[PDB]
Design a protein around this ligand. Structure first.
Ligand SMILES: [Cl-]
Ligand SMILES: [Cl-]
Ligand SMILES: [Cl-]
Ligand SMILES: [Cl-]
Ligand SMILES: [Cl-]
Ligand SMILES: [Cl-]
Ligand SMILES: [Cl-]
Length: 194
């Protein structure tokens, strides 16, 4: 096991990982065997941490484990693109706050119905430092922790709705995210290109 408490990216037991925090409260990630990682957070500001891949792409992600937010947290397949710069989310679980923006329609994937949203952040933290970028959201209509996310279904449906992804230059991870909250996650990821 390797405990992570500081903004870094890395590799661990075959998997890319990523941890980001704005410094608030107490936040840790523990990297275990294969696809497994745990997080623990107490009164965070904002953090994102997970395991996956150095590069996004159309794969079938399998994951399992537990996700217990007290207040605002997300469980999401998460990453970035360049040219253009996009932060993207496929959200399977959340706490008291459901992500929302400009509604674009639905996509059905992996046994669920996902609402598609677009929002924008101005002069915000990014993989390319302080930047302005669009966020693409798929948000399941019902909470679950575990199953397959077929990324191709989400990418194809965003594309049909005017949401163009750039290049998969950046990581794609199964993320735990927290805003002004506390909780834990314990998640195992694997997957493969479709
Ligand atoms: Cl909850
Ligand atoms: Cl709307
Ligand atoms: Cl659903
Ligand atoms: Cl639900
Ligand atoms: Cl759950
Ligand atoms: Cl599934
Ligand atoms: Cl809290």
């Amino acid at each position: 096991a390797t405990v992570i408490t500081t903004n870094q990216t890395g590799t661990n037991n075959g998997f890319y990982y990523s941890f980001w925090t704005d410094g608030g409260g107490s936040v840790s990630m523990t990297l275990n065997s294969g696809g497994n990682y745990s997080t623990s957070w107490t009164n965070c500001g904002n953090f994102v941490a997970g395991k996956g891949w150095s590069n996004g792409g159309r794969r079938n992600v399998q994951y399992s484990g537990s996700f217990y937010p007290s207040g605002n947290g997300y469980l999401a397949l998460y990453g970035w693109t360049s040219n253009p710069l996009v932060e993207y989310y496929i959200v399977d679980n959340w706490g008291n706050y459901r992500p929302t923006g400009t509604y674009k329609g639905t996509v059905t994937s992996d046994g669920g119905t996902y609402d598609v949203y677009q929002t924008t952040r101005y002069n915000a933290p990014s993989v390319e430092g302080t930047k302005t970028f669009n966020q693409y959201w798929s948000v399941r209509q019902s909470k679950r922790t575990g199953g397959t996310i077929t990324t191709g279904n989400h990418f194809d449906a965003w594309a049909r709705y005017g949401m163009q992804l750039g290049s998969f230059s950046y990581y794609m991870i199964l993320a735990t995210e927290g805003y002004q909250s506390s909780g834990s996650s314990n998640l195992t990821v694997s997957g493969k290109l479709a």
